[PDB]
Amino acid sequence: GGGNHQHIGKP
Amino acid sequence: GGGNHQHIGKP
Amino acid sequence: WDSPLRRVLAELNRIPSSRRRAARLFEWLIAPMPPDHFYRRLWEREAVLVRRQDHTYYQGLFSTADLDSMLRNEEVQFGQHLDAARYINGRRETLNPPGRALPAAAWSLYQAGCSLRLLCPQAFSTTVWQFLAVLQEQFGSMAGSNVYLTPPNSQGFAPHYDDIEAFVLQLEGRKLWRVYRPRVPTEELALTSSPNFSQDDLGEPVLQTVLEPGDLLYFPRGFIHQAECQDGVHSLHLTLSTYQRNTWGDFLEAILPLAVQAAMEENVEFRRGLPRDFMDYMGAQHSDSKDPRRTAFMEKVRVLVARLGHFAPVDAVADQRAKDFIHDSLPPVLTDRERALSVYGLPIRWEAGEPVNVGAQLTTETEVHMLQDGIARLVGEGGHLFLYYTVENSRVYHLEEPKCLEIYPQQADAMELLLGSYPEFVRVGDLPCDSVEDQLSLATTLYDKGLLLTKMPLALN
Amino acid sequence: WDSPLRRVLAELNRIPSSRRRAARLFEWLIAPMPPDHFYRRLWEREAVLVRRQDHTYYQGLFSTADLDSMLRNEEVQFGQHLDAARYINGRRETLNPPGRALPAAAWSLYQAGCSLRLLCPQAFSTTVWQFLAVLQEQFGSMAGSNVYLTPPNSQGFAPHYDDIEAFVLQLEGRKLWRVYRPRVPTEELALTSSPNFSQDDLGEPVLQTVLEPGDLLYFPRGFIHQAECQDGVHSLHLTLSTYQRNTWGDFLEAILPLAVQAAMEENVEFRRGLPRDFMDYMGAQHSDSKDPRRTAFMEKVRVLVARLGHFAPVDAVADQRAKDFIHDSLPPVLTDRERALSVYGLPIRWEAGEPVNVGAQLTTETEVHMLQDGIARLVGEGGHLFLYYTVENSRVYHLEEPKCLEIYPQQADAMELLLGSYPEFVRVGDLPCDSVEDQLSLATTLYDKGLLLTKMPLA
Ligand SMILES: O=C(O)CNC(=O)C(=O)O
Ligand SMILES: O=C(O)CNC(=O)C(=O)O
Ligand code: NI
Ligand code: NI
């Protein structure tokens, strides 16, 4: 499992 | 026209 | 049917300047804390909790009902738009099935203990769009957001720090938050997001609280945080993020190659040959040499590097970042007046077999000013002049390529005036161009693009 | 048959150190001027003429006959290896027909008044090779050459400046030269070659001389020059070039991105956010603003920029340049003794149905040193240790990829020694390694690659 806040709104 | 000294030995 | 958020939006719609609207919204966002105090003392320095004592403060911004509609009525995909996340045995998991995120799949994942995170709320909600579009203008940096919906008695995400400045807006429910100071000098104002951490990696929280709707929690990039739902309620929150890679070092990174190149072109000391034999005393293998040429080689590096300050094209780099910002920006949200005074509000439409209201033109007597203050930047590139603008940007980050138009040298002065004097009206006829042709064509080109407004509508019903 | 060049070469062959061979050759090249004077006062500063008073000085280096055999016996191609050039009525022309440059085509172009320029003499001539291979080692920069053959009563090339330091070796015939100081501050030590110029673009020559065989003319990059053959004799000359893009600035170019990256990793002032509103007072549009935030923003940039000197990985950039120089280098020219003491001189051959003389192996008692002093460089990359070397380079620039081998940590100290103590012999057994397995394998690996010699032939 991976990612936290994605500011740009994409993966 | 064209090129002068070719230090590298190459074009 | 009314709320503080609904009222502030109506209030913004009556504030004629976009710069002022932005300041006012950010004041509202952190109220009652003064922005000036916040920016001087807390921004990039401390975690900050604002206990609102008002569960309704954000009503109208985003709700779980909104999310449920969007899953039904929009083409929301797992991965691209929505994540399903769990944090369970010290382990972060991701449970996204590939494809469409229908209600039926999303809610069963929720029911099984998965948090749902919407990556681009602003693409689906006009209120979140307006929110971010207004706020970006006082950040000088893209404002993004994610929405995090977490089910009862669960944690969705591992403790971590992110690479942005974060404002958590508690929307519904309750959540227990733990926020930690940077663990080490190197983590203070981190450049990149951290890995998921374990509890053994954590120190003592500097802030531990149960957020409730209306509350705000802010913390700088590098502050570890984690969150949980207890006591059988869910949580929904929106995290507003900004200032991704907007540091002094990122400014330098762009400045330096240009400065060196300029230094080499303009000063022979930067063009002189290296020593023929520097490889005898420089290099890893020579790291302990007592050759004084080593000493001098180092000094020279530092003296030359120091002198680069003089060759740094600071304004040029400022304009390239401005231009990047223009590209990253959400497109603007127009007040009713702005709409009514611009190309967007022209009453021209099709009725009974024909277009009505054709043709009301700009003249030298038309008084104008830029549509808003944060939609355009004039940038010189390749000895040409280009006006970059936001008014055709998508609500999705970089979905459209950068938009611009060329401004001819004859028209440059008039354009600079326009941008530098918002929101003061100027007669087209008093714009600094030689002719009446150039006056009229700049103004008209700006108008038709949706960059300009008129003191009165050009066309009436 | 004996000439000063042939004698200095036979002399080099008796000088055990490659570093000394290189210094000695450069001394010969500019004799009787002292190298130290030349480097301190003339290099990168002044045009220099050396009137040799000895037409035979360069005999054996390269001749027009050598060129004639080359055209006949090697696959010399127009464009790739050989240009035909004219300068008449102020216009530079290039007249290369596509394909093979046979004698028949080259000589009728010569006859019709074209200069012939060979771009890589060293690929086709073992003497020019040696000449450049030795000299590169005291320049610390690639030594290139072109050969220029110009027919009587013609000029081959427009006035221009080049991007290198140039040494013109007059070989046969005579040529009238004009060399000019840089015309303006920005032309002094120019970064790139100029366009072909016209005579209305020129000032007054600082040096105007008829060169004769044996003479030398040196001038810095940025110095305009041009040359003509008069009277009735042709000209041949070899121009030795060096110091392409080897400036303080080129060093900084590579230093700076690393320095900022390190400053950002290790110091929070470089990680602090920009002002939210700097776009209000910075940019072209604000070039005249009196906002004191503007003056503070400039000052901070100059202070942060200054502080980067502290974070600059100077040795790592030194080693990257060393690595690039290793890649650019011509392969080494071995003395008879070096050959004989190395893998190259092992007498193992095929004799009547079989290999004869398998040599000894090396042992702890074998005394060793690097084959030469300028063939190898140890460079750290990605927490790995890589020995880059020149011994398998082509005589053609970058025809082969960069050649390297990995040195394990166990073996790094012993490799460092080897490279820092040339030419002193070291017993393999005394090499700083944990084991005698590491001692033996570093030496053996180095030897088989042609990187190491032995005090006595292994056979
Ligand atoms: O809600 C959570 O568990 C985590 N939320 C965040 O990390 C955030 O909003 O930046
Ligand atoms: O021989 C000529 O006319 C041209 N020579 C040069 O430009 C040179 O040697 O660098
Ligand atoms: Ni987070
Ligand atoms: Ni030249």
Author numbering:
A (entry chain D), B (entry chain C): 212 to 222
C (entry chain B): 181 to 641
D (entry chain A): 181 to 639
The authors write:
Nucleolar protein 66 (NO66) is a JmjC domain-containing protein which has been reported to be a histone demethylase and a ribosome protein 8 (Rpl8) hydroxylase. Nucleolar protein 66 (NO66) is a metazoan JmjC domain-containing protein that is highly conserved throughout evolution and was initially identified as a dual-location intranuclear protein. Evidence from a recent study indicated that NO66 hydroxylates ribosome protein 8 (Rpl8) and controls the biogenesis of the ribosome, which is consistent with the observation that NO66 is a constitutive nucleolar component. Moreover, previous work demonstrated that NO66 assembles as a tetramer and that the binding site of NO66 to osterix is located on the surface formed by a hinge region (interface I) from neighbouring subunits in the tetramer.
To gain insight into the molecular mechanisms for the enzymatic activity of NO66, we solved the crystal structure of NO66176–C in complex with Rpl8204–224 at 2.2 Å resolution. The fragment of NO66 that we used for structural analysis lacks the N-terminal 175 amino acids (referred to as NO66176–C). To determine the complex structure of NO66176–C and Rpl8204–224, Fe2+ ion and αKG were substituted by Ni2+ and NOG to prevent the reaction catalyzed by NO66 during crystallization. In the complex structure of NO66176–C and Rpl8204–224 only residues 212–222 of Rpl8 are visible in the electron-density map. In the complex structure, Rpl8204–224 forms a U-shaped conformation with a bulge-shaped structure in the middle of the peptide. In the active site of NO66, two histidine residues of the Rpl8204–224 peptide, His216 and His218, are accommodated in two deeply buried pockets. His216 is directed to the active centre by forming hydrogen bonds to Tyr328 and Ser421. The side chains of Asn215, His216 and His218 form hydrogen bonds to amino-acid residues from NO66, which determines the specificity of the recognition between NO66 and Rpl8. The distance between the active sites in the dimer linked by interface II is 1.8 Å closer in the complex structure than in NO66176–C–Ni2+.
